[PDB]
C-alpha cells in the first residue's frame, strides 16, 4: 500500500465551512441521516412502547 495521508489532509482541510462529520463528502451526509433517523425513529418507538406498557394487559 501507498501512503495517501497527504491527500486526506488536503480534503479535510479544504476551506469549505463543513463541520468535520460531513467534510468527507456526500457519504457522510447519508450515514448521518441514517443514524439520526434510526435514533429519532427508535426514540419515538420507545415512547410508543412506554405508552403500551403503562397500562394493564401485562
Amino acid at each position: 500500500f501507498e501512503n495517501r495521508v497527504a491527500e486526506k489532509q488536503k480534503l479535510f482541510q479544504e476551506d469549505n465551512g463543513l463541520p468535520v462529520h460531513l467534510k468527507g463528502g456526500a457519504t457522510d451526509n447519508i450515514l448521518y441521516r441514517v443514524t439520526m433517523t434510526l435514533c429519532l425513529g427508535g426514540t419515538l418507538y420507545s415512547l410508543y412502547c412506554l405508552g403500551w406498557a403503562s397500562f394493564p394487559h401485562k
Binding site: 500500500f1 501512503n3 495517501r4 495521508v5 486526506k8 489532509q9 480534503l11 479535510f12 482541510q13 463541520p19 468535520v20 462529520h21 467534510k23 468527507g24 450515514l31 448521518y32 441514517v34 443514524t35 439520526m36 434510526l38 435514533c39 429519532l40 425513529g41 427508535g42 426514540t43 418507538y45 420507545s46 412502547c49 412506554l50 406498557a53
Partner: protein, 259 residues
C-alpha cells in the same frame, strides 16, 4: 484565531445519537426481558455502533488529517484514557468483592463449603492455563509492536500487531469453547453467577480491546501513525494490558484459588 494549543471541536451530533442509543439499548433490554421482543434492542445496538464509528472516525479526521492533536491535546487524551481505565478497574473490583464475599463465607445452601456441593470446577491447569499463556504472550507481542513503531519499522509493527490480535481472537475462541463445555451454568448458584458474570465482562473487554487493536492495525496499514505520534495505538496497548491484568486476577482468584 486562537493562540492556545487546545482543540475547539466542531459542533457534533454524535453525543446526542450516542445518548439516544443508550436509551434504545436499555429500553430495548427491558423490552427483551419483559415484553419478549428484540426490536428496540437491535435498533439501539445498531445506532450505538454507528455512533462509535462516526465519532472515532471524526477523531481520526481531526488528528491525522487536520492536525489538531498538539502535545497539550495528546496529554489530555493520555489522562482521559488512564482515568477511563481506572473506572473500569473499579467496576471489576465490585465483581471480585462479590466473588470473595460468597466464597470466603459459603452459606448452608451451598453445603457450607467452597466450591459448593455439586459444582465441578474446570481444571485451572488445562484451558485456563492456556488462556493465561495466550494473553501474557499477547502482552509481549504488543510491546514488540510498540517498539517497532517507535523505531519506524512498518513491517514488524504490522507483524507484531497481527500476532497480538490473533492471540486475542484465540483467547476468545477458547473461552467460547470453555463456556459451551462447562458443566455448570450461570444459573448454578453464586458459583455460576460470579464465574460467568466476571469472566463474561472480561471476555467482553477482550473483544472490545481486540476491536481497538484491529482499528489500529488498519490505521497502521493506512500510514496514519508516525514514529512519534500514535496515541490511539498507545491507548489500545494500555487497555490491552488492563485486560491481561484483569485476567491474571481472575485466573488466580476464581479459577485457581476458587477451585
Amino acid at each position: 484565531h486562537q493562540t492556545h494549543a487546545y482543540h475547539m471541536v466542531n459542533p457534533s451530533p454524535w453525543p446526542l445519537t450516542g445518548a439516544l442509543s443508550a436509551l434504545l439499548m436499555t429500553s430495548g433490554l427491558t423490552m427483551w426481558f419483559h415484553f419478549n421482543s428484540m426490536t428496540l434492542l437491535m435498533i439501539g445496538l445498531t445506532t450505538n455502533m454507528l455512533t462509535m464509528y462516526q465519532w472515532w472516525r471524526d477523531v481520526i479526521r481531526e488528528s491525522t488529517f487536520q492536525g489538531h492533536h498538539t502535545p497539550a491535546v495528546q496529554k489530555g487524551l493520555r489522562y482521559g484514557m488512564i482515568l477511563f481505565i481506572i473506572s473500569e478497574v473499579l467496576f471489576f473490583t465490585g465483581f471480585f468483592w462479590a466473588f470473595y464475599h460468597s466464597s470466603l463465607a459459603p452459606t448452608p445452601e451451598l453445603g457450607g463449603c467452597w466450591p459448593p456441593t455439586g459444582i465441578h470446577p474446570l481444571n485451572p491447569l488445562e484451558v485456563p492455563l492456556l488462556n493465561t499463556s495466550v494473553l501474557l504472550a499477547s502482552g509481549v507481542s504488543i510491546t514488540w509492536a510498540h517498539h517497532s513503531l517507535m523505531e519506524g519499522d512498518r513491517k514488524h509493527m504490522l507483524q507484531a500487531l497481527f500476532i497480538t490480535i490473533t492471540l486475542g481472537v484465540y483467547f476468545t475462541l477458547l473461552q467460547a469453547s470453555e463456556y459451551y463445555e462447562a458443566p455448570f451454568t450461570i444459573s448454578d448458584g453464586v458459583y455460576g453467577s460470579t464465574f460467568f458474570v466476571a469472566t463474561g465482562f472480561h471476555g467482553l473487554h477482550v473483544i472490545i480491546g481486540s476491536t481497538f487493536l484491529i482499528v489500529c492495525f488498519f490505521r497502521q496499514l493506512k500510514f496514519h501513525f508516525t514514529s512519534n505520534h500514535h496515541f490511539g495505538f498507545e491507548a489500545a496497548a494500555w487497555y490491552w494490558h488492563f485486560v491481561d491484568v484483569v485476567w491474571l486476577f481472575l485466573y488466580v482468584s476464581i479459577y485457581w484459588w476458587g477451585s
